[PDB]
Amino acid sequence: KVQLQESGGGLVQAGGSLRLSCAASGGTFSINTLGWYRRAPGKEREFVARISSGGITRYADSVKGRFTISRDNGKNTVYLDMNSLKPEDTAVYYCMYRNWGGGLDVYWGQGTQVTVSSG
Ligand SMILES: [Cl-]
Ligand SMILES: [Cl-]
Ligand SMILES: [Cl-]
Ligand code: NA
Numbered sequence: 001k002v003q004l005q006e007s008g009g010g011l012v013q014a015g016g017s018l019r020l021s022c023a024a025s026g027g028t029f030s031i032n033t034l035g036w037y038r039r040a041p042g043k044e045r046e047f048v049a050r051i052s053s054g055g056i057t058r059y060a061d062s063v064k065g066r067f068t069i070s071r072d073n074g075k076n077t078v079y080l081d082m083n084s085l086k087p088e089d090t091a092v093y094y095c096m097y098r099n100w101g102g103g104l105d106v107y108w109g110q111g112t113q114v115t116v117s118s119g
Helices: none
Strands: 003-008 010-013 018-025 033-039 046-051 057-059 067-072 077-082 091-098 106-108 112-117
Touching (some): 003 091, 018 112, 033 067, 033 077, 046 067, 046 077, 046 091, 057 067
Parallel strands (some): 010 112
Antiparallel strands (some): 018 077, 033 091, 091 106
């Protein structure tokens, strides 16, 4: 019963910065965990980041020190601010909505491409 909408992403120069966002509706946003996974060309889908209802963050080692995840319960939106980007970050990024309220246990976004080019 939750719908997700991803925004942002696209082409960006190595070393540069890029924001992804994901907006949800239909659930109880304030109590749920939001995050991102990604699938890079060589690889299978992997955890990138998540943020609890209470603002507690977690990052995969691959992006720790470079990515910041945040949320605005006012707009039902989660943000992924990506910095120091490199070709290893080229991938399809999927929004994640881990549910503690009514509905399915988890919902996934359709995926947003991020492509890192030379600097
Ligand atoms: Cl929601
Ligand atoms: Cl997770
Ligand atoms: Cl962490
Ligand atoms: Na809200």
